[PDB]
Design a protein around this ligand. Structure first.
Ligand SMILES: *[C@@H]1O[C@H](CO)[C@@H](O[C@@H]2O[C@H](CO)[C@@H](O[C@H]3O[C@H](CO[C@H]4O[C@H](CO)[C@@H](O)[C@H](O)[C@@H]4O)[C@@H](O)[C@H](O)[C@@H]3O)[C@H](O)[C@H]2NC(C)=O)[C@H](O)[C@H]1NC(C)=O
Ligand SMILES: *[C@@H]1O[C@H](CO)[C@@H](O)[C@H](O)[C@H]1NC(C)=O
Ligand SMILES: [Ca+2]
Ligand SMILES: [Ca+2]
Ligand SMILES: [Ca+2]
Ligand SMILES: [Ca+2]
Ligand SMILES: [Ca+2]
Ligand SMILES: [Ca+2]
Lengths: 241, 218
């Protein structure tokens, strides 16, 4: 039993992050603190890396994909690490409005919702990123630009709602577990069309579950800054047509 | 009630705006206006067609921009200012009320300058003034609803000269590019100076710089 605190057993999965249980040995409070991701560092080949993820400093031995790129500490420095708080509201409002805004045309601001790269062929990561957000579908879609801009900025790549055959967003109602609609189950595409080529420069997620892990890690170390009631994240495969 | 100091107690049409103190040293902004009632209709945010001529300073654009298009959205203003004339197109700032993004989006359109040069005295030393050129030019462009830029010398350097009491401010020389002005544009520098003087006279001018005076020169 890698979880030495007894009181933690009763509290894993209760839908509440319990900070006394937020450790690898306690599975990040049974996933309550890591957006349900069991172990975000499952594939990481170096044991010290989860401890160096949150330091805003490049740790080269932790910069592999499997080690979640050291929270991009080695690929983005200085002003390029965050969208300028002063420009954020503008970028959120002009995201995917069909007109190119070069000042938002960066991976840290969300690539302007691809307004500047719309003729570049889509390059989707494998699978679908599935998010549970405690906002009903109509309310969630009412601020889809802000939601997608901020989530794109966090993942430093382009995100959008996956659409069905009739052009409708794959956003489904979420019901209170064992009734009423409490939130949304959101399905997203990850478009990596603006990613870098060289092994040293590339810092995109090749599949949905990889991006989920990174988000889970941001939550585990109290670094995720996303103004939405985000409950869980995961990657799912899709069958072929 | 020529003091070189704006006194609101003396700032009235009857006293020539404190001798031009409050109208940025512009003696009479309505000098060319073919109508007498216009100074009273300039500030009402309502279209008065009889004052909508250029010489009557377009009735403060009340007939050309009355709705949401009169000012750059306060929420986006800081972004537009910082990204003005940075050589990259920002379509969200690409409007006359936001300063046309410093013409970043119209590089294929031939320059079309108004007559003369707009000369401003600003109580900021040149080095400090130049440190915020984008904000200064963007805000001034938005107000004039056209494109403004520094005049360059033979070595391509901005013509911003020290202003002495030594070094109390700057004398700035600007050009007006009307290439995107398709009546609501100023044909010459003095007209734009007059309009600015008019805004100051009626306390409508909102410009976060210690702006002393304005004038047109050929
Ligand atoms: C991983 O690194 C992060 C920094 O890169 C650490 O997050 C930062 O933590 C500090 C202190 O814990 C916090 O400072 C402010 O905290 C107080 C308010 O906290 C609330 O408000 C902020 C502002 O929106 C919010 O982000 C917090 O999550 C919380 O809701 C202030 O009263 C205090 O004076 C101080 O200014 C930073 O805000 C916070 N930064 C971010 C981006 O979250 C994080 O703690 C670390 N992980 C650890 C230590 O486990
Ligand atoms: C013109 O209108 C503005 C808008 O409130 C006002 O602040 C200003 O005092 C007015 N001008 C005069 C001369 O009253
Ligand atoms: Ca818990
Ligand atoms: Ca690090
Ligand atoms: Ca855009
Ligand atoms: Ca006076
Ligand atoms: Ca009017
Ligand atoms: Ca620009």
């Amino acid at each position: 039993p890698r979880c030495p605190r007894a009181a933690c057993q009763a509290k894993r999965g209760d839908q509440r992050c319990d900070r006394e249980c937020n450790s690898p040995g306690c599975g990040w409070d049974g996933g309550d603190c890591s957006l349900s991701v069991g172990d975000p560092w499952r594939q990481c080949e170096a044991l010290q890396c989860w401890r160096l993820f949150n330091n805003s400093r490049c740790d080269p031995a932790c910069s592999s994909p499997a080690c979640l790129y050291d929270n991009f500490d080695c690929h983005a420095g200085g002003r390029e690490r965050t969208c300028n708080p002063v420009y954020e509201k503008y970028c959120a409002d002009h995201f995917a409005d069909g007109r190119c805004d070069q000042g938002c045309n960066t991976e840290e601001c969300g690539w302007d919702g691809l307004d500047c790269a719309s003729e570049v062929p889509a390059l989707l990561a494998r699978g679908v990123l599935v998010l549970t957000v405690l906002l009903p579908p109509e309310e969630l879609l009412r601020s889809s630009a802000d939601f997608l801009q901020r989530l794109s900025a966090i993942l430093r790549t382009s995100l959008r709602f996956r659409l069905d055959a009739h052009g409708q967003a794959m956003v489904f109602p979420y019901h209170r577990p064992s009734p009423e609609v409490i939130g949304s189950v959101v399905m997203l595409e990850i478009d990596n069309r603006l990613c870098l080529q060289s092994p040293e420069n590339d810092h995109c997620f090749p599949d949905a579950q990889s991006a989920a892990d990174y988000l889970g890690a941001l939550s585990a170390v109290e670094r995720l800054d996303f103004p939405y009631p985000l409950r869980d994240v995961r990657g799912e495969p899709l069958e072929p047509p």
